Design an enzyme around this catalytic site. Structure first.
Site, PDB file in Angstrom:
ATOM      1  N   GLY A  26       0.794  -1.212   0.000  1.00 25.51           N
ATOM      2  CA  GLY A  26       0.000   0.000   0.000  1.00 25.51           C
ATOM      3  C   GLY A  26       0.829   1.266   0.000  1.00 25.51           C
ATOM      4  O   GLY A  26       1.879   1.334   0.648  1.00 25.51           O
ATOM      5  N   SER A  27       0.360   2.285  -0.722  1.00 22.56           N
ATOM      6  CA  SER A  27       1.092   3.543  -0.790  1.00 22.56           C
ATOM      7  C   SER A  27       0.786   4.441   0.407  1.00 22.56           C
ATOM      8  O   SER A  27       1.698   5.054   0.971  1.00 22.56           O
ATOM      9  CB  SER A  27       0.771   4.263  -2.101  1.00 22.56           C
ATOM     10  N   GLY A  28      -0.480   4.531   0.810  1.00 23.28           N
ATOM     11  CA  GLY A  28      -0.865   5.398   1.911  1.00 23.28           C
ATOM     12  C   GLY A  28      -1.266   4.622   3.148  1.00 23.28           C
ATOM     13  O   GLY A  28      -2.175   3.788   3.098  1.00 23.28           O
ATOM     14  N   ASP A 142     -14.577   4.329  13.472  1.00 28.41           N
ATOM     15  CA  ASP A 142     -14.048   4.595  12.137  1.00 28.41           C
ATOM     16  C   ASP A 142     -14.354   3.450  11.179  1.00 28.41           C
ATOM     17  O   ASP A 142     -13.471   2.995  10.444  1.00 28.41           O
ATOM     18  CB  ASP A 142     -12.539   4.846  12.194  1.00 28.41           C
TER      19      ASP A 142
HETATM   20  C1  LIG Z   1      -7.840  -0.401   2.052  1.00 26.73           C
HETATM   21  C2  LIG Z   1      -6.709  -0.910   2.949  1.00 26.73           C
HETATM   22  C3  LIG Z   1      -5.392  -0.613   2.246  1.00 26.73           C
HETATM   23  O1  LIG Z   1      -5.411  -0.189   1.090  1.00 26.73           O
HETATM   24  N1  LIG Z   1      -4.273  -0.592   2.986  1.00 26.73           N
HETATM   25  C4  LIG Z   1      -3.022  -0.301   2.276  1.00 26.73           C
HETATM   26  C5  LIG Z   1      -2.494  -1.675   1.980  1.00 26.73           C
HETATM   27  C6  LIG Z   1      -2.273  -2.417   3.312  1.00 26.73           C
HETATM   28  C7  LIG Z   1      -3.565  -2.555   4.128  1.00 26.73           C
HETATM   29  N2  LIG Z   1      -3.271  -3.284   5.389  1.00 26.73           N
HETATM   30  N3  LIG Z   1      -3.084  -2.952   6.495  1.00 26.73           N
HETATM   31  C8  LIG Z   1      -2.664  -3.972   7.255  1.00 26.73           C
HETATM   32  C9  LIG Z   1      -2.455  -3.877   8.601  1.00 26.73           C
HETATM   33  C10 LIG Z   1      -1.717  -4.870   9.222  1.00 26.73           C
HETATM   34  C11 LIG Z   1      -1.417  -4.918  10.567  1.00 26.73           C
HETATM   35  C12 LIG Z   1      -1.975  -3.980  11.402  1.00 26.73           C
HETATM   36  C13 LIG Z   1      -2.784  -2.999  10.853  1.00 26.73           C
HETATM   37  C14 LIG Z   1      -3.324  -2.072  11.733  1.00 26.73           C
HETATM   38  C15 LIG Z   1      -4.143  -1.056  11.272  1.00 26.73           C
HETATM   39  C16 LIG Z   1      -4.417  -0.982   9.915  1.00 26.73           C
HETATM   40  C17 LIG Z   1      -3.879  -1.914   9.035  1.00 26.73           C
HETATM   41  C18 LIG Z   1      -3.050  -2.941   9.477  1.00 26.73           C
HETATM   42  C19 LIG Z   1      -2.749  -5.084   6.472  1.00 26.73           C
HETATM   43  C20 LIG Z   1      -2.552  -6.428   6.532  1.00 26.73           C
HETATM   44  N4  LIG Z   1      -2.237  -7.024   7.670  1.00 26.73           N
HETATM   45  N5  LIG Z   1      -2.673  -7.235   5.470  1.00 26.73           N
HETATM   46  C21 LIG Z   1      -3.009  -6.717   4.235  1.00 26.73           C
HETATM   47  N6  LIG Z   1      -3.207  -5.349   4.180  1.00 26.73           N
HETATM   48  C22 LIG Z   1      -3.061  -4.585   5.272  1.00 26.73           C
HETATM   49  C23 LIG Z   1      -4.055  -1.126   4.344  1.00 26.73           C
END
Ligand SMILES: */C=C/C(=O)N1CCC[C@@H](n2nc(-c3cccc4ccccc34)c3c(N)ncnc32)C1
EC number: 2.7.12.2
Length: 282
Positions: A26-28, A142
């Protein structure tokens, strides 16, 4: 404790050197999320790197989300934590490697998401929010499509508890009582359902955040359209979720008994293959 990875019942003593960085996801973000392969078991996991040099406000939400996830080890509808690594300069949070969020799924689909997929999504998200309110007294604050994660195996879980309360989110999905002062996440879930079922965000052509809040209070609740073959139970669940007056909005345990949720608990929907099909067209 730190220095361990609990992936599938089994614990593994590990350090940050035991994980191979496969690139940024992910970029953002709200913090650098890496795709990493555990060299000791071939497992590929998602590791968020929180630097102690990082932003003070961003690190606060990362720790708040980690606090809720560590408490939700028994909820299958919440993204699970595998372990943490604390170094002299960083904190690595290993979590379940999901596929993508519902927002990116809507962008890749370039259109509406089928009701049978949103039915399984609703059952998972509602039970996840119910688990936070009863077992921990936590409000998400959220709920939005970007916070709904899906994977190759059809799992649907809730992800980001960075601004969760113990009892301000995106203005697009904020309940009327949160703009003009419990069940506020129910309204956010309803707004997300309309956006994913129609492919268009219900409050269209709002150039500022305050204009969105104006439409939430001034305009009628954006109900589900009636010319897209939506079942009667789907349109009924969205109508109750989008009740303007929060005193008449159903609490969770009434939502969990809705015919829309009871249908997709027993129904067998192949989310795994639908997810794999959409992912094959980027
Ligand atoms: C629409 C969501 C998205 O585009 N993004 C960017 C790509 C990665 C996405 N993402 N977040 C996590 C993640 C992992 C661990 C802890 C947390 C805590 C808060 C928010 C996100 C996360 C992701 C995981 N584990 N796997 C795939 N993508 C993840 C957010």
């Amino acid at each position: 404790q730190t220095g361990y990875l609990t992936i599938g019942g089994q614990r593994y003593q590990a350090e940050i050197n035991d994980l191979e960085n496969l690139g940024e996801m992910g970029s953002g973000t709200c913090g650098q999320v890496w795709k990493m392969r555990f060299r000791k078991t071939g497992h590929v996991i998602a590791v968020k790197q929180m630097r102690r040099s990082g932003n003070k406000e961003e690190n606060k939400r990362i720790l708040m989300d980690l606090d809720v996830v560590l408490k939700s080890h028994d909820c299958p509808y919440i993204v699970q934590c595998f372990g943490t690594f604390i170094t002299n300069t960083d904190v690595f949070i290993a979590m379940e490697l999901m596929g993508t969020c519902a927002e990116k799924l809507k962008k890749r689909m370039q259109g509406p998401i089928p009701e049978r997929i949103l039915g399984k999504m609703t059952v998972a998200i509602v039970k996840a929010l119910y688990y936070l309110k009863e077992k921990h007294g936590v409000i998400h604050r959220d709920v939005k499509p970007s916070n709904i994660l899906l994977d190759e195996r059809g799992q649907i879980k809730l992800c980001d508890f960075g601004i969760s309360g113990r009892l301000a989110g995106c203005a697009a999905y904020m309940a009327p009582e949160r703009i003009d002062p419990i069940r506020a996440d129910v309204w956010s879930l309803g707004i997300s359902l309309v956006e994913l079922a129609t492919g268009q965000f219900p409050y269209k052509n709002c150039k500022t955040d305050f204009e969105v809040l104006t439409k939430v209070l001034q305009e009628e609740p954006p109900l589900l359209p009636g010319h897209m073959g939506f079942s009667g139970d789907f349109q009924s669940f969205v109508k109750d979720c989008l009740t303007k007056d929060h005193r008449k909005r159903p609490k969770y345990n009434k939502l969990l008994e809705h015919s829309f949720i009871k249908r997709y608990e027993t129904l067998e929907v192949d989310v795994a293959s639908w997810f794999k099909d959409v992912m094959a067209k980027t």
